Design a binder for these strands. Sequence first.
DNA 1: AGATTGTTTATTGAGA
DNA 2: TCTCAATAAACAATCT
Length: 116
Amino acid sequence: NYQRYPKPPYSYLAMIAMVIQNSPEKKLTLSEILKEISTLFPFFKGNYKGWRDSVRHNLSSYDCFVKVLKDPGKPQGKGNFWTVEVNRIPLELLKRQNTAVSRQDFAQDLAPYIFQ
DNA sequence: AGATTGTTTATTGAGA
DNA sequence: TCTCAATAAACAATCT
């Protein structure tokens, strides 16, 4: 039960960091991240919704994404803010990937959207 | 009751 | 032929 989708040629890591870093407070809920990613990359407004799980997975699986409690009172509370420590980002992951999509035809490097 | 969030385990497949 | 980003899903706990 597996298949690759014609997503934009940027890593989920890069797209997440970009939307976070461009938010007014440099922090966003998961919900806001998903919304903002689909706004910048229309593909994600479509039928396929598994990208939402993928995004959730990246947040927990890279050290550059640090969770911040929405309520100090509840350490196990939901709807927390996510932030990015940009210096903890492996720079190759911000480059445009060569995949089916980018072989057909934002910029080649997302660093100038992130190091802001 | 069903959806969402955060964490984790696991597999896949294509690019270097 | 080896790697790891992409993708799928289990599980617990909160949330609507």
